[PDB]
Amino acid sequence: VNSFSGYLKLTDNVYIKNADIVEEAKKVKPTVVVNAANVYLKHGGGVAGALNKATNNAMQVESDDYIATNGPLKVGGSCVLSGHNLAKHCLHVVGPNVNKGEDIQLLKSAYENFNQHEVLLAPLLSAGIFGADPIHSLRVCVDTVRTNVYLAVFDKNLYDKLVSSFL
Ligand SMILES: Cn1ncc(C(=O)O)c1-c1ccccc1
């Protein structure tokens, strides 16, 4: 049993809810929250900008030190950093950004990072301002992630379309 509440069960291991991932993280304090990161860990907008704002910019300060030491992530890659006030850990995962022309086949590689964690609170990778089709992102998630993933979807309209169209 875990603390997640109000989710619709899609599969053995994938759950979904219409929720603000920031408000959900603050309530649950999950072991892992996933950030929709870019390779520079520049948390300007979308999910990343909202998570970083909720940490009072401490996520960005920590991320700038990570990049200064290690250099940029790979598209499809990830790193584990602090969850600050939101979670124990933040898994920063880089899905491909269609608005930069990145290979959508890298979305499966991105979701494979989730398999290193038994339970996660996450957004749909490459959705929103990363430009991919969220229906596609949910299908790759279900077909790639084997650990228990609790997906938070920001737009109610999109949430209802994801559920209604789910095979
Ligand atoms: C495009 N996309 N992908 C995921 C989501 C979301 O609401 O989580 C969205 C979205 C859709 C409409 C407005 C805002 C976000």
DSSP string, 71-125: -PPPTT-EEEEE-TTT-SEEEEE----GGGT--TTHHHHHHHGGGGSSEEEEPPT
Choosing from 17, 21, 154 the residue with most ligand 1 atoms within 8 A of its CB, the one to mutate for a pocket test is 154
How many Å apart are CA 145 and CA 159, to the nearest integer?
A: 19
Residue 129 contacts residue 98 (beta carbons within 8 Å):
no
How many Å apart are CA 113 and CA 54, to the nearest integer?
A: 24
Q: Give 62: exposed, middle or buried? Use CB within 10 Å, 0-12, 13-18, 19+.
A: middle
Q: How many residues does the chain have?
A: 167
Say which residues have a Cβ less than 8 Å from residue 165's Cβ, sequence separation at least 6.
135
Measuring CA to CA, how many Å separate 101 from each of 44, 95, 104, 126, 134?
Answer: 19, 12, 9, 12, 17
Host domain of residue 47: 1-167
Q: What is the resolution of this structure in A?
A: 1.0
CA 134 to ligand 1: nearest atom: 3
3-state secondary structure 2-17: CCCCCCEECCCCEEEE
Q: Cβ atoms within 10 A of the Cβ of 25, count?
A: 24
How many Å apart are CA 53 and CA 84, to the nearest integer?
A: 11
**Elucidation technique:** X-ray
In 3D space, the residue among 127, 121, 114, 122 whose CA is nearest the CA of residue 158 turns out to be 127
Q: Give 100: exposed, middle or buried? Use CB within 10 Å, 0-12, 13-18, 19+.
A: exposed
Domain count, the chain: 1
Residue 31 contacts residue 89 (beta carbons within 8 Å):
yes
Q: Give 76: exposed, middle or buried? Use CB within 10 Å, 0-12, 13-18, 19+.
A: buried
In short, whether 127's Cβ falls inside 6 Å of ligand 1 is: yes
